[PDB]
Amino acid sequence: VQLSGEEKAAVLALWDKVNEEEVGGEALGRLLVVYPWTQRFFDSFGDLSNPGAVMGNPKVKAHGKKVLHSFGEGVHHLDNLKGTFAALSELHCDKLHVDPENFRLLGNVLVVVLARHFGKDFTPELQASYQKVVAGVANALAHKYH
Amino acid sequence: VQLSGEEKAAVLALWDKVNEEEVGGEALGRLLVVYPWTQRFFDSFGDLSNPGAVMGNPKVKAHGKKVLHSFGEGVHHLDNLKGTFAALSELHCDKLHVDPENFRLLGNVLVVVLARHFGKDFTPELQASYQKVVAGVANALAHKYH
Amino acid sequence: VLSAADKTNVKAAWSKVGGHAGEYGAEALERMFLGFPTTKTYFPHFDLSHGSAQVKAHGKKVGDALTLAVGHLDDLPGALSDLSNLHAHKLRVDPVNFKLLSHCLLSTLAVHLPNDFTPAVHASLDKFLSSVSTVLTSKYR
Amino acid sequence: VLSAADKTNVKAAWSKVGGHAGEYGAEALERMFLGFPTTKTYFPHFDLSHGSAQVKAHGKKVGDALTLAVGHLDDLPGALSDLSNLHAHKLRVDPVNFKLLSHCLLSTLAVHLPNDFTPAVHASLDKFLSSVSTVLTSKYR
Ligand code: HEM
Ligand code: HEM
Ligand code: HEM
Numbered sequence: 115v116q117l118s119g120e121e122k123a124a125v126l127a128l129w130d131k132v133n134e135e136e137v138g139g140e141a142l143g144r145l146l147v148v149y150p151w152t153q154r155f156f157d158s159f160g161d162l163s164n165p166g167a168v169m170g171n172p173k174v175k176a177h178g179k180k181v182l183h184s185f186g187e188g189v190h191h192l193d194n195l196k197g198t199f200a201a202l203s204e205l206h207c208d209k210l211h212v213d214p215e216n217f218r219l220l221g222n223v224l225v226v227v228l229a230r231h232f233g234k235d236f237t238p239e240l241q242a243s244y245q246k247v248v249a250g251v252a253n254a255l256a257h258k259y260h
Numbered sequence: 261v262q263l264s265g266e267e268k269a270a271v272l273a274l275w276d277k278v279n280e281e282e283v284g285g286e287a288l289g290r291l292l293v294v295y296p297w298t299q300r301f302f303d304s305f306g307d308l309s310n311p312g313a314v315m316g317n318p319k320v321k322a323h324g325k326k327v328l329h330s331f332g333e334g335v336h337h338l339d340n341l342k343g344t345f346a347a348l349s350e351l352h353c354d355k356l357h358v359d360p361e362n363f364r365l366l367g368n369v370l371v372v373v374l375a376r377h378f379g380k381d382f383t384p385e386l387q388a389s390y391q392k393v394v395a396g397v398a399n400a401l402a403h404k405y406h
Numbered sequence: 407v408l409s410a411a412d413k414t415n416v417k418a419a420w421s422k423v424g425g426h427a428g429e430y431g432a433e434a435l436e437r438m439f440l441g442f443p444t445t446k447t448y449f450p451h452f453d454l455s456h457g458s459a460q461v462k463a464h465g466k467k468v469g470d471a472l473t474l475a476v477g478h479l480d481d482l483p484g485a486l487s488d489l490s491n492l493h494a495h496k497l498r499v500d501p502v503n504f505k506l507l508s509h510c511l512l513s514t515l516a517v518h519l520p521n522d523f524t525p526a527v528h529a530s531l532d533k534f535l536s537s538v539s540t541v542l543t544s545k546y547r
Numbered sequence: 548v549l550s551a552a553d554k555t556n557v558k559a560a561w562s563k564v565g566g567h568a569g570e571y572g573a574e575a576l577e578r579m580f581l582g583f584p585t586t587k588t589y590f591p592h593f594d595l596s597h598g599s600a601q602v603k604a605h606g607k608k609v610g611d612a613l614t615l616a617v618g619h620l621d622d623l624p625g626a627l628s629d630l631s632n633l634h635a636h637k638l639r640v641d642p643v644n645f646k647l648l649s650h651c652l653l654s655t656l657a658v659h660l661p662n663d664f665t666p667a668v669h670a671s672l673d674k675f676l677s678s679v680s681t682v683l684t685s686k687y688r
């Protein structure tokens with residue numbers, strides 16, 4: 115679950131620039147739109163029928179911020195991913211019954227949203243480092259499962 | 261990782277009746293026939309063109325016996341899987357580059373083969389226990405992933 | 407996806423299944439709820455008890471639906487559209503669940519027809535279940 | 548799998564890609580090789596070095612193949628038949644790798660067309676790539 119010393123430096127330096135509100139809200143919104151079955155877990159939020167309603171939903175934006183803040187804990191604790199997500203692993207696996215594959219799907223959507231926000235600066239080398247972080251976060255969340 | 265008191269008992273009780281020769285071979289054989297992309301890792305075994313050549317292949321039968329031996333060491337070391345498969349993990353992951361998803365497929369095929377040999381004695385409650393074992397083994401083998 | 411050989415295998419194999427489709431569908435469900443508890447999520451209003459009449463009644467539905475699909479291998483999207491609207495648009499079932507049921511269905515078939523469940527039939531039957539699954543998880547209208 | 552709205556979104560999305568399909572294909576491959584080293588196993592006979600001309604040429608092939616598919620959405624199995632034979636029977640590519648390349652293609656599109664890569668476009672493009680992937684991994688001789 116780790117990267118080169120120069121990888122962490124690059125990963126964290128980019129995070130200094132991430133707006134958790136804008137990125138978080140877009141990531142959760144694109145998850146619900148691209149993989150519709152995930153809407154099933156957020157019916158309490160309201161109308162999620164079309165992308166217009168989803169991206170403009172305040173609940174989606176607010177929750178997306180919370181999710182992104184969690185990835186932030188991950189990024190700042192890469193050596194202790196399992197411990198950082200123990201509580202959330204219990205919630206998502208034992209309480210919500212969310213299939214693990216979905217942890218991996220949200221991870222990639224997030225990377226796609228980072229690519230859209232930083233453009234040519236999100237180099238293939240930078241993405242490669244983030245594919246490790248996202249993989250690690252997903253694995254740690256699936257721990258309490260197995 | 262964990263099974264109930266009489267879960268382990270019913271599981272081992274069935275394993276004691278498993279034919280070490282046949283089972284493993286049919287399981288690897290079915291994997292190669294149902295999911296043909298796996299044949300890519302066994303070209304040196306020879307002809308894997310049609311189901312007739314695969315099930316009758318000597319290399320496949322022998323190697324299957326080994327594989328079946330490993331699940332055994334898995335069914336007997338449930339509480340310490342990540343240690344019993346640490347070596348094989350480095351092999352399949354670091355050396356062969358086998359995608360984790362395949363570890364899952366073989367586990368499941370093994371379960372279908374077990375269902376075929378034992379019939380109604382392979383109750384839904386028993387299969388449930390074996391699905392835990394199969395999940396545990398797949399995870400341990402994927403653990404050392406890089 | 408479904409070649410000519412697969413089609414023949416499927417039609418031939420389902421004939422061996424016959425009127426037991428409903429029974430098998432019910433057993434497959436039971437194996438799924440136990441083996442993968444995460445699937446009980448879609449049946450909150452169900453008596454998932456051992457030997458439940460609700461599970462039996464539902465298994466029958468799943469069973470006839472597959473028999474209907476075997477008769478329309480050349481047009482599953484059209485023949486299964488009402489079930490696609492149900493599972494994809496209304497229930498929004500996670501596609502991973504279909505792989506679990508498929509696996510549990512094949513296990514059930516290996517139990518009751520061990521001599522007919524040959525590797526070749528196993529391969530075709532698996533491609534057949536995947537196609538059906540794709541159609542039920544897709545929102546195509 | 549693909550609704551009318553999806554086909555519309557794809558055709559429109561590829562129209563913005565224009566003549567850069569090959570460039571994007573090349574970049575996506577570079578992103579895939581670095582992000583998931585496992586994929587390099589399939590290209591032993593390649594110079595996967597930074598800026599390699601082989602990757603560039605292959606990117607062009609992949610890009611044209613995709614433009615070809617966008618022109619035949621209503622019959623991907625037939626328009627991509629030769630490609631399926633190559634990837635499924637001859638190469639025996641693990642279907643998992645197709646998800647990797649598709650993700651790297653979407654990432655590349657997000658980078659170059661940030662204002663056009665909308666949620667709806669993203670969703671249709673994803674179903675599109677999944678459809679093409681299923682055709683290239685299915686052995687339906
Ligand atoms: C890597 C992925 C994920 C991360 C890091 C993440 C993070 C979180 C966090 C931080 C919470 C907040 C809990 C609290 O307020 O105490 C949460 C709640 C929740 N998550 Fe996730 N999540 C992930 C994936 C998913 C997925 C894929 C689904 C389902 C498809 C999901 C469904 C939920 C639901 C329903 C809740 C409860 C929401 C509420 O009522 O506040 N999560 N998650
Ligand atoms: C739970 C799943 C699996 C278990 C328990 C397992 C176990 C083993 C064992 C015990 C060996 C013997 C190594 C030795 O003799 O030192 C082995 C070797 C190997 N395995 Fe697996 N394996 C699994 C899945 C797979 C899968 C899915 C593939 C490929 C798709 C694979 C490909 C190989 C290959 C190519 C070798 C080397 C064969 C040789 O050169 O003799 N294995 N495996
Ligand atoms: C390929 C297999 C599947 C087929 C062919 C199938 C078929 C059917 C049929 C025929 C019905 C409608 C019966 C009626 O009108 O009363 C139905 C309902 C339903 N199915 Fe499926 N199904 C399949 C997979 C799934 C999966 C994987 C799940 C999720 C675990 C699921 C969850 C449900 C639910 C919740 C209902 C409604 C149950 C109720 O409220 O009575 N189905 N399915």
Ligand code: HEM
Binds near residue numbers: 590612613640
């Ligand atoms: C859906 C996306 C894909 C498309 C449309 C695609 C397209 C192509 C095309 C058009 C060619 C042959 C071009 C020629 O004849 O010169 C090709 C060859 C090949 N593809 Fe793919 N491909 C895809 C995904 C993959 C994946 C995921 C892998 C594996 C990581 C892969 C591995 C190969 C290899 C190794 C070759 C042969 C390369 C050579 O020896 O020149 N392809 N692909």
